[PDB]
């Protein structure tokens, strides 16, 4: 009977989101909704889906996600897993929904809400990337540059000093992947951060 | 962002409903569930758009006039008898 | 309004900004914040924890605590040492 219970819970979450004015009130009402112990992924997934289904990205949903992942630690882990899942399943979303999801996750990352551990799931190699993933990344990084200023971004990328190591973003020195990384990161508009790897091609 | 306009919206929507309640010579709340006012026109309702059905944020009044403090409490808006979540109109309008 | 007690009308509506000035008296600039002043304080000590204190009333400060416990079973004598009472042992004293 979990199909009907899950559908009813999803409907209640959607109605609660749509009957809210500001993100604080929506979070308070969502916290009032009781839910089974292991399905905390469902609330985050429907928050992201509702964000995607709307015409233009409104900071409402980014603020909702940021507040939940700042409320506790389980929500932050849930959101990192949500990003991990949504990256692999991004080829099946149209351009507008992809843009909305990219804005959501970019607002989450730009405020240090989920931590940049998520970037260990990225990899810029043709064997596991598509056009949709490329556009997803460009939108995320453009928003993050705009929000932070491209000044602090190069420190945030240059000093991982944790389990993030950018082994797909900054590819391990092998094959043609470094060329892909460099020309994509200069095509997007970033350019500066790739100068550090620009010397590797000289080295090898 | 204007907390005065929100309570004005609640008040004015409530009095718009009160006009209909008065016209039938009874303004009892049991007689008029939200399905009477907010159900679409083709179903026989009034088709009223709703925004007074939301929580109004509150903060301590001592420091509200002198600083912007965090939202620590919520005062209920128009009450719906039972568990009903009438959708907000603003959620279907994209911000500027 | 104490959250378990009644709620009335203000009885004093004269709080408009006719002075139009903050009086530079209650401003955050020159005040030490340690703990918020709850209304329980304003009701317990009406003349100290709030200005504009008119028509307030004072209540009995304290009463001697009653130490009578009714007997559980009539078979026991009326005068009997209750085990709840701590024993009278105070060998911590320095007398003459």
């Amino acid at each position: 009977q979990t199909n009907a219970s899950l559908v009813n819970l999803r409907k209640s979450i959607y109605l609660t989101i749509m009957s809210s004015v500001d993100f604080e009130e929506c979070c308070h009402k969502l916290l009032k909704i009781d839910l089974p112990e292991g399905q905390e992924i469902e609330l985050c997934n429907m928050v992201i889906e509702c964000n995607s289904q709307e015409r233009t990205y409104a900071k409402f949903y980014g603020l909702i996600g940021e507040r939940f992942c700042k409320l506790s630690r389980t929500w932050r882990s849930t959101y990192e897993q949500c990003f991990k899942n949504y990256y692999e399943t991004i080829h099946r979303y149209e351009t507008n929904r992809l843009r909305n999801i990219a804005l959501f996750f970019a607002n989450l990352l730009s405020t240090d809400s989920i931590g940049w551990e998520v970037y260990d799931c990225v990899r810029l190699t043709e064997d596991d990337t598509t056009a949709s993933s490329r556009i997803f990344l460009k939108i995320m990084f453009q928003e993050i540059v705009e929000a932070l200023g491209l000044k602090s971004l190069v420190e945030r990328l240059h000093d991982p000093n944790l389990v993030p190591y950018l082994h797909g973003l900054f590819p391990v020195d092998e094959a043609r992947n470094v060329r892909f990384s460099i020309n994509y990161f200069t095509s997007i508009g970033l350019g500066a951060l790739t100068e550090e790897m620009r010397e590797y091609l000289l080295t090898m | 962002s204007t907390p005065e306009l929100l309570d004005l919206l609640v008040k004015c929507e409530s009095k718009i409903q009160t006009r209909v309640k008065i016209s039938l010579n009874s303004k009892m709340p049991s007689r008029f569930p939200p399905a009477v006012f907010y159900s679409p026109k083709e179903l026989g309702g009034l088709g009223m758009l709703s925004m007074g059905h939301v929580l109004i944020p509150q903060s301590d009044l001592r420091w509200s006039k002198q600083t912007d403090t965090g939202i620590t409490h919520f005062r209920s808006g128009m009450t719906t008898n039972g568990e009903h979540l009438i959708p907000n109109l603003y959620r279907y309008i994209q911000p500027w | 309004a104490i959250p378990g007690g009644p709620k009335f009308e203000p009885l004093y509506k004269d709080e408009a900004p006719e002075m139009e000035d903050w009086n530079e008296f209650n401003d955050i600039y020159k005040l030490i914040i340690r703990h918020p002043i709850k209304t329980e304080y304003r009701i317990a000590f009406p003349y100290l924890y709030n200005s504009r204190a008119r028509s307030v009333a004072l209540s009995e400060y304290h009463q001697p605590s009653n130490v009578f416990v009714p007997p559980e079973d009539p078979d026991l004598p009326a005068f009997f040492w209750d085990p709840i009472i701590n024993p009278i042992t105070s060998r911590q004293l320095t007398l003459h």
Partner: peptide, 29 residues
């Protein structure tokens, strides 16, 4: 009407008062 939260009287507004806690407030030689 309590700790600076609430309106002086529910009469005059379309509400019943009934303030609730935020339940999402972030308490940090």
């Amino acid at each position: 009407s309590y700790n600076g939260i609430g309106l002086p009287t529910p009469r005059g507004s379309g509400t019943n008062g009934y303030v609730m806690r935020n339940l999402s407030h972030v308490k940090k030689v």
